[PDB]
């Protein structure tokens, strides 16, 4: 198969995003950001999570925002490149609300998408993910993208395109994920990476009634083979970047406090499945977290699925 490669202009934008945002400490933190649903208007916070996972220490140095840092962000770019290939192989790819599919995107569109994805979680000021915090943080990332685009990317994006990609990053309450293939592929890429920080319920069963799991979603879009290959590829990127790689164990699914109908559905789609976990690794975590050189070296080390190709 061919390798998944990011454009060099994209890697320059990743450096700016890292230096100005992803390397920076979260600011919506401390005693003023604690929360209790019983006394909810007590502090600046409107929900839980502001003080969660703010940083981790590796050899005496702090790696800020490790759940939403450089390695997270760059992995998402690899996934969009991969799904672009899978969509072009599909007999009947997914038709977004504009009538367009991922298979209708050009190589230039993927470049643009990749740039936008670098800013998708860059506006976060904590791990808070309740609605108000989530939406404010996506608004901030959208504005950081627009400011940088006007300063350096107007040879690539028109003003109309800057506003289109900014609206994708903003992920508005009232917008669907599949309004356009540009926005859909951004959401799908983010979705795949959630395996780093979600239990088996969200990954395979769907987080609530009426929601498909992460992996079922990939199987519905790309077929069972390619959907499972995407999952395993993401796992590979996890190991290369020192993430904890989750175990998979479908025999445990009925014992996790969820309704039996959600478990039957997941087994009929995915099948029985068992895959070992792997512990996090501090040295790889640091290598991938502290520099685009480090991060891209790790990511490009991982073999791609056998079917991955790109027109050159």
């Amino acid at each position: 198969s061919m390798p998944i490669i990011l454009d060099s202009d994209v890697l320059e934008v990743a450096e700016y995003v890292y230096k100005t945002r992803l390397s920076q400490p979260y600011t919506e933190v401390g005693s003023e950001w604690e929360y209790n649903y019983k006394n909810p208007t007590a502090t600046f916070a409107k929900g839980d999570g502001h003080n969660l996972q703010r940083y981790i220490t590796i050899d005496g140095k702090q790696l800020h925002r490790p759940i939403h840092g450089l390695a997270h962000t760059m992995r998402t770019l690899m996934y969009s490149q991969l799904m672009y290939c899978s969509s072009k192989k599909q007999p009947s790819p997914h038709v977004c609300q504009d009538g367009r599919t991922i298979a209708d995107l050009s190589e230039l569109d993927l470049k643009k998408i990749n740039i936008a994805q670098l800013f998708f979680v860059a506006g976060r000021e904590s791990e808070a993910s309740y609605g108000d915090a989530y939406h404010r943080y996506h608004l901030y990332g959208a504005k950081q993208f627009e400011e940088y685009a006007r300063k350096h990317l107007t040879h690539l994006f028109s003003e109309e395109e800057i506003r289109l990609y900014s609206r994708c990053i903003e992920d508005r309450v009232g917008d669907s994920f599949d309004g356009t293939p540009e926005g859909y592929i951004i959401h799908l890429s983010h979705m795949i990476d959630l395996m780093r920080c979600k239990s088996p319920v969200e990954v395979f069963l769907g987080h609530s009634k009426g929601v498909s799991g992460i992996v079922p979603t990939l199987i519905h879009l790309f077929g069972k083979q390619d959907g499972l290959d995407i999952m395993h590829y993401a796992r590979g990127l996890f190991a290369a970047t020192g993430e904890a790689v989750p175990y998979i164990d479908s025999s445990e699914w009925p014992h996790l406090g969820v309704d039996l109908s959600r478990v039957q559905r997941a087994l009929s789609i995915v099948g029985d499945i068992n895959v070992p976990g792997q512990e996090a690794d501090s040295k790889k975590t640091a290598q991938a977290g502290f520099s685009v050189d480090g991060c891209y070296s790790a990511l490009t080390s991982v073999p791609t699925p056998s079917w991955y190709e790109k027109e050159l």
Binding site: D48, L52, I58, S129, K198, Y247
Partner: protein, 76 residues
Amino acid sequence: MQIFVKTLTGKTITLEVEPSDTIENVKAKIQDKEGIPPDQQRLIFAGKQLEDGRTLSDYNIQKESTLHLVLRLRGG
């Protein structure tokens, strides 16, 4: 009553708890047993991330239920 807490890689402990115990108290029990600061503990049950101020019984957590703990890096 006993519950299970498993990391995403499958490392397992039990805790001795009561239905009314807050999530904040469960995290202090985890810190006591395993040395993990409460602010490194992201806990999940039945697909939902747990809030400090709510109780095990608020989430329908019962005897021999399993919670998942998303730990990024042991010793980090």
